[PDB]
Protein backbone atom coordinates (compact mmCIF):
# COMPACT_ATOMS: atom_id res chain seq x y z
CA UNK A 1 0.00 0.00 0.00
CA UNK A 2 3.17 2.13 -0.29
CA UNK A 3 2.49 4.74 -2.95
CA UNK A 4 4.99 7.00 -4.60
CA UNK A 5 2.46 9.49 -3.34
CA UNK A 6 2.74 9.45 0.47
CA UNK A 7 6.08 10.12 2.15
CA UNK A 8 7.69 10.99 5.42
CA UNK A 9 11.11 12.65 5.81
CA UNK A 10 12.42 12.86 9.40
CA UNK A 11 15.62 14.85 9.80
CA UNK A 12 16.79 15.86 13.19
CA UNK A 13 13.91 16.90 15.40
CA UNK A 14 11.64 17.71 12.49
CA UNK A 15 9.36 15.65 10.26
CA UNK A 16 7.44 16.33 7.04
CA UNK A 17 4.58 14.20 5.72
CA UNK A 18 3.15 14.52 2.23
CA UNK A 19 0.12 12.57 1.07
CA UNK A 20 0.45 13.74 -2.54
CA UNK A 21 4.03 13.53 -3.67
CA UNK A 22 5.39 12.67 -7.16
CA UNK A 23 8.49 10.63 -6.22
CA UNK A 24 11.56 12.79 -5.29
CA UNK A 25 14.63 13.75 -7.24
CA UNK A 26 18.17 13.18 -6.07
CA UNK A 27 20.42 15.49 -8.06
CA UNK A 28 22.66 13.65 -10.51
CA UNK A 29 21.58 10.51 -8.75
CA UNK A 30 23.89 11.18 -5.79
CA UNK A 31 22.93 11.50 -2.13
CA UNK A 32 24.69 14.00 0.16
CA UNK A 33 27.80 12.48 1.89
CA UNK A 34 30.64 13.92 4.07
CA UNK A 35 34.00 14.94 2.74
CA UNK A 36 36.36 12.00 2.34
CA UNK A 37 40.03 12.32 3.34
CA UNK A 38 41.27 11.42 -0.11
CA UNK A 39 39.51 14.61 -1.28
CA UNK A 40 40.51 16.80 1.67
CA UNK A 41 43.00 19.65 1.58
CA UNK A 42 42.57 21.89 4.67
CA UNK A 43 44.24 20.03 7.57
CA UNK A 44 41.69 21.14 10.14
CA UNK A 45 39.41 18.53 11.79
CA UNK A 46 35.84 19.64 10.78
CA UNK A 47 32.81 20.18 13.11
CA UNK A 48 29.64 18.21 12.41
CA UNK A 49 26.85 19.66 14.52
CA UNK A 50 24.62 16.92 13.20
CA UNK A 51 21.03 17.15 14.44
CA UNK A 52 21.22 20.80 15.52
CA UNK A 53 21.90 21.97 11.97
CA UNK A 54 20.44 19.07 9.95
CA UNK A 55 16.75 19.72 10.58
CA UNK A 56 14.03 21.41 8.49
CA UNK A 57 13.79 25.24 8.36
CA UNK A 58 10.54 26.57 6.80
CA UNK A 59 11.18 29.92 5.07
CA UNK A 60 8.45 32.55 5.01
CA UNK A 61 5.59 31.88 2.61
CA UNK A 62 5.05 33.28 -0.93
CA UNK A 63 1.73 34.05 -2.65
CA UNK A 64 1.07 32.70 -6.12
CA UNK A 65 -1.30 34.88 -7.97
CA UNK A 66 -2.21 35.11 -11.54
CA UNK A 67 0.40 37.69 -12.09
CA UNK A 68 3.35 35.88 -10.46
CA UNK A 69 6.54 35.53 -12.47
CA UNK A 70 8.52 33.14 -10.16
CA UNK A 71 10.90 33.37 -7.12
CA UNK A 72 14.55 32.52 -6.63
CA UNK A 73 16.45 31.61 -3.43
CA UNK A 74 20.21 30.97 -3.15
CA UNK A 75 21.86 28.34 -0.82
CA UNK A 76 23.36 28.55 1.71
CA UNK A 77 22.10 32.18 1.80
CA UNK A 78 18.43 31.46 2.36
CA UNK A 79 19.46 29.77 5.60
CA UNK A 80 22.02 32.43 6.80
CA UNK A 81 19.78 33.17 9.75
CA UNK A 82 18.25 29.83 10.67
CA UNK A 83 19.09 28.69 14.18
CA UNK A 84 22.51 27.21 14.79
CA UNK A 85 23.01 26.50 11.04
CA UNK A 86 23.41 30.20 10.51
CA UNK A 87 25.68 30.82 13.50
CA UNK A 88 28.09 28.09 12.38
CA UNK A 89 28.02 29.68 8.96
CA UNK A 90 29.24 33.11 10.13
CA UNK A 91 31.68 31.69 12.63
CA UNK A 92 33.72 29.22 10.47
CA UNK A 93 36.02 30.10 7.61
CA UNK A 94 34.74 27.18 5.48
CA UNK A 95 31.69 24.88 5.59
CA UNK A 96 30.02 22.38 3.23
CA UNK A 97 26.49 20.98 2.99
CA UNK A 98 23.85 19.10 0.97
CA UNK A 99 20.09 19.79 1.45
CA UNK A 100 16.63 18.29 1.23
CA UNK A 101 14.28 20.94 -0.38
CA UNK A 102 10.50 20.37 0.03
CA UNK A 103 8.26 22.91 -1.87
CA UNK A 104 4.57 22.86 -0.88
CA UNK A 105 1.45 24.11 -2.65
CA UNK A 106 -2.01 22.55 -2.22
CA UNK A 107 -5.27 23.60 -3.96
CA UNK A 108 -8.43 21.59 -4.87
CA UNK A 109 -9.55 19.39 -7.82
CA UNK A 110 -11.07 22.48 -9.49
CA UNK A 111 -7.82 24.53 -9.59
CA UNK A 112 -5.23 24.30 -12.42
CA UNK A 113 -1.68 25.70 -12.48
CA UNK A 114 1.75 24.08 -12.65
CA UNK A 115 5.03 25.30 -11.01
CA UNK A 116 8.56 24.18 -12.12
CA UNK A 117 10.82 23.57 -9.06
CA UNK A 118 14.48 23.44 -10.24
CA UNK A 119 17.94 23.49 -8.64
CA UNK A 120 20.68 25.19 -10.70
CA UNK A 121 24.32 24.52 -9.66
CA UNK A 122 26.34 27.71 -9.98
CA UNK A 123 23.61 30.08 -11.15
CA UNK A 124 25.67 33.22 -12.02
CA UNK A 125 23.02 35.97 -12.59
CA UNK A 126 23.16 38.70 -15.27
CA UNK A 127 23.03 42.47 -14.71
CA UNK A 128 19.97 44.01 -16.43
CA UNK A 129 22.27 46.89 -17.42
CA UNK A 130 24.06 44.74 -20.05
CA UNK A 131 27.70 45.35 -20.92
CA UNK A 132 29.85 44.25 -17.99
CA UNK A 133 27.87 45.87 -15.18
CA UNK A 134 28.26 43.61 -12.08
CA UNK A 135 25.47 42.45 -9.76
CA UNK A 136 26.25 43.73 -6.27
CA UNK A 137 26.55 41.36 -3.32
CA UNK A 138 23.47 42.38 -1.49
CA UNK A 139 21.46 41.69 -4.59
CA UNK A 140 22.57 38.10 -4.81
CA UNK A 141 22.19 37.54 -1.08
CA UNK A 142 18.50 38.20 -0.52
CA UNK A 143 18.40 35.88 2.50
CA UNK A 144 15.17 34.06 3.33
CA UNK A 145 13.22 36.59 1.29
CA UNK A 146 14.78 35.30 -1.94
CA UNK A 147 14.47 37.29 -5.16
CA UNK A 148 11.00 38.03 -6.63
CA UNK A 149 11.15 37.85 -10.36
CA UNK A 150 8.15 40.14 -10.68
CA UNK A 151 9.75 42.89 -8.61
CA UNK A 152 11.29 45.84 -10.49
CA UNK A 153 14.83 46.14 -11.85
CA UNK A 154 16.96 47.81 -9.15
CA UNK A 155 20.44 49.28 -9.52
CA UNK A 156 23.22 46.83 -9.00
CA UNK A 157 20.68 44.05 -8.90
CA UNK A 158 20.23 41.20 -11.41
CA UNK A 159 17.82 41.13 -14.39
CA UNK A 160 14.48 39.41 -13.49
CA UNK A 161 13.22 38.37 -16.91
CA UNK A 162 11.85 34.80 -16.64
CA UNK A 163 12.09 33.36 -20.14
CA UNK A 164 15.84 33.95 -19.78
CA UNK A 165 16.57 32.26 -16.41
CA UNK A 166 18.29 35.46 -15.19
CA UNK A 167 21.27 34.55 -17.40
CA UNK A 168 20.80 34.43 -21.17
CA UNK A 169 19.36 30.89 -21.46
CA UNK A 170 15.75 29.91 -22.23
CA UNK A 171 13.20 28.89 -19.56
CA UNK A 172 12.30 25.86 -21.65
CA UNK A 173 15.74 24.25 -21.12
CA UNK A 174 15.90 24.47 -17.35
CA UNK A 175 14.67 20.90 -17.50
CA UNK A 176 18.29 19.79 -18.02
CA UNK A 177 18.75 20.67 -14.25
CA UNK A 178 17.40 18.34 -11.48
CA UNK A 179 13.81 19.50 -11.19
CA UNK A 180 10.23 18.38 -10.46
CA UNK A 181 6.84 20.01 -11.41
CA UNK A 182 3.96 20.71 -8.95
CA UNK A 183 0.79 20.31 -11.19
CA UNK A 184 -2.21 21.05 -8.95
CA UNK A 185 -4.02 18.23 -10.64
CA UNK A 186 -1.35 15.65 -9.70
CA UNK A 187 1.12 16.79 -7.16
CA UNK A 188 1.06 19.11 -4.08
CA UNK A 189 4.77 19.03 -3.15
CA UNK A 190 8.17 18.72 -4.89
CA UNK A 191 11.23 17.27 -3.06
CA UNK A 192 14.80 17.41 -4.31
CA UNK A 193 17.89 16.05 -2.42
CA UNK A 194 21.00 18.10 -3.28
CA UNK A 195 24.48 16.60 -2.87
CA UNK A 196 27.31 19.16 -2.40
CA UNK A 197 28.53 20.22 -5.92
CA UNK A 198 31.71 22.35 -6.17
CA UNK A 199 35.15 22.42 -7.87
CA UNK A 200 36.82 22.63 -4.44
CA UNK A 201 36.37 20.26 -1.50
CA UNK A 202 34.99 22.90 0.87
CA UNK A 203 34.47 26.61 0.30
CA UNK A 204 33.35 29.82 1.96
CA UNK A 205 29.63 29.90 2.78
CA UNK A 206 29.32 33.64 2.49
CA UNK A 207 31.19 34.68 -0.65
CA UNK A 208 29.77 31.91 -2.83
CA UNK A 209 26.29 30.38 -3.14
CA UNK A 210 26.39 26.97 -4.79
CA UNK A 211 22.78 26.44 -5.94
CA UNK A 212 19.76 28.65 -6.59
CA UNK A 213 16.40 26.95 -5.97
CA UNK A 214 13.84 28.46 -8.38
CA UNK A 215 10.02 28.04 -8.24
CA UNK A 216 8.38 29.35 -11.50
CA UNK A 217 4.66 29.29 -12.38
CA UNK A 218 4.51 27.94 -15.98
CA UNK A 219 0.82 27.07 -16.48
CA UNK A 220 -0.84 30.08 -14.80
CA UNK A 221 -2.90 29.59 -11.65
CA UNK A 222 -6.59 29.26 -12.49
CA UNK A 223 -8.99 29.15 -9.54
CA UNK A 224 -12.55 27.85 -9.56
CA UNK A 225 -15.25 30.42 -10.01
CA UNK A 226 -15.47 33.05 -7.37
CA UNK A 227 -12.58 31.40 -5.56
CA UNK A 228 -9.96 33.69 -4.14
CA UNK A 229 -7.50 34.13 -6.91
CA UNK A 230 -4.34 33.04 -5.09
CA UNK A 231 -2.54 30.16 -3.27
CA UNK A 232 0.46 30.40 -0.85
CA UNK A 233 3.61 28.44 -1.80
CA UNK A 234 5.85 27.41 1.19
CA UNK A 235 9.52 26.34 0.91
CA UNK A 236 11.01 24.15 3.78
CA UNK A 237 14.74 23.29 3.46
CA UNK A 238 17.06 21.10 5.62
CA UNK A 239 20.86 21.14 5.56
CA UNK A 240 22.16 17.55 5.47
CA UNK A 241 25.61 16.18 6.16
CA UNK A 242 26.84 19.70 7.12
CA UNK A 243 30.48 20.20 8.11
CA UNK A 244 32.15 23.44 9.22
CA UNK A 245 35.88 24.04 9.44
CA UNK A 246 38.30 26.85 10.33
CA UNK A 247 36.56 28.42 13.33
CA UNK A 248 37.39 31.90 14.50
CA UNK A 249 36.09 35.34 14.90
CA UNK A 250 32.80 35.57 12.97
CA UNK A 251 32.48 37.08 9.51
CA UNK A 252 31.04 40.56 8.94
CA UNK A 253 29.36 40.80 5.52
CA UNK A 254 28.04 43.70 3.58
CA UNK A 255 24.77 45.28 4.47
Amino acid sequence: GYSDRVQQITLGNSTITTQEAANAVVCYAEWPEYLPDVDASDVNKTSKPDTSVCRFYTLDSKTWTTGSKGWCWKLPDALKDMGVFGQNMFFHSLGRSGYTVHVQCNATKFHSGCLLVVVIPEHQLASHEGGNVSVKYTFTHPGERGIDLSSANEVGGPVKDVVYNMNGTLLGNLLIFPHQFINLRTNNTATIVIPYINSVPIDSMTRHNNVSLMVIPIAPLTVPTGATPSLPITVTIAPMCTEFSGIRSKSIVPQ
Binding site: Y2, S3, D4, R5, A22, N23, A24, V25, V26, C27, Y28, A29, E30, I176, P178, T186, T191, V193
Partner: protein, 40 residues
Protein backbone atom coordinates in the same frame (compact mmCIF):
# COMPACT_ATOMS: atom_id res chain seq x y z
CA UNK B 1 54.90 6.28 -28.94
CA UNK B 2 55.08 9.33 -26.70
CA UNK B 3 58.10 11.46 -27.67
CA UNK B 4 57.67 13.76 -24.73
CA UNK B 5 57.95 13.39 -21.02
CA UNK B 6 54.90 15.19 -19.66
CA UNK B 7 51.34 13.89 -19.87
CA UNK B 8 49.90 17.14 -21.16
CA UNK B 9 51.88 16.67 -24.24
CA UNK B 10 50.12 13.55 -25.46
CA UNK B 11 47.40 13.59 -28.08
CA UNK B 12 43.66 13.60 -27.56
CA UNK B 13 42.12 11.08 -25.23
CA UNK B 14 40.13 8.13 -26.83
CA UNK B 15 36.36 7.59 -26.44
CA UNK B 16 34.90 7.47 -23.02
CA UNK B 17 32.67 4.79 -24.31
CA UNK B 18 31.17 5.47 -20.87
CA UNK B 19 27.63 6.72 -21.53
CA UNK B 20 25.01 6.56 -18.79
CA UNK B 21 22.19 9.01 -19.12
CA UNK B 22 20.37 7.87 -16.02
CA UNK B 23 21.97 10.48 -13.77
CA UNK B 24 20.23 13.05 -16.01
CA UNK B 25 17.14 11.18 -17.25
CA UNK B 26 16.05 9.30 -14.14
CA UNK B 27 17.38 10.91 -11.00
CA UNK B 28 14.28 9.77 -9.04
CA UNK B 29 14.64 8.44 -5.50
CA UNK B 30 12.23 5.48 -5.85
CA UNK B 31 12.83 3.57 -9.06
CA UNK B 32 10.24 3.83 -11.78
CA UNK B 33 9.51 0.79 -13.99
CA UNK B 34 8.33 1.47 -17.53
CA UNK B 35 4.86 -0.09 -17.87
CA UNK B 36 4.06 0.09 -14.21
CA UNK B 37 1.93 3.08 -13.25
CA UNK B 38 3.87 6.31 -12.65
CA UNK B 39 1.95 7.22 -9.50
CA UNK B 40 0.58 4.41 -7.36
Amino acid sequence: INYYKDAASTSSAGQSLSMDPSKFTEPVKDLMLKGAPALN
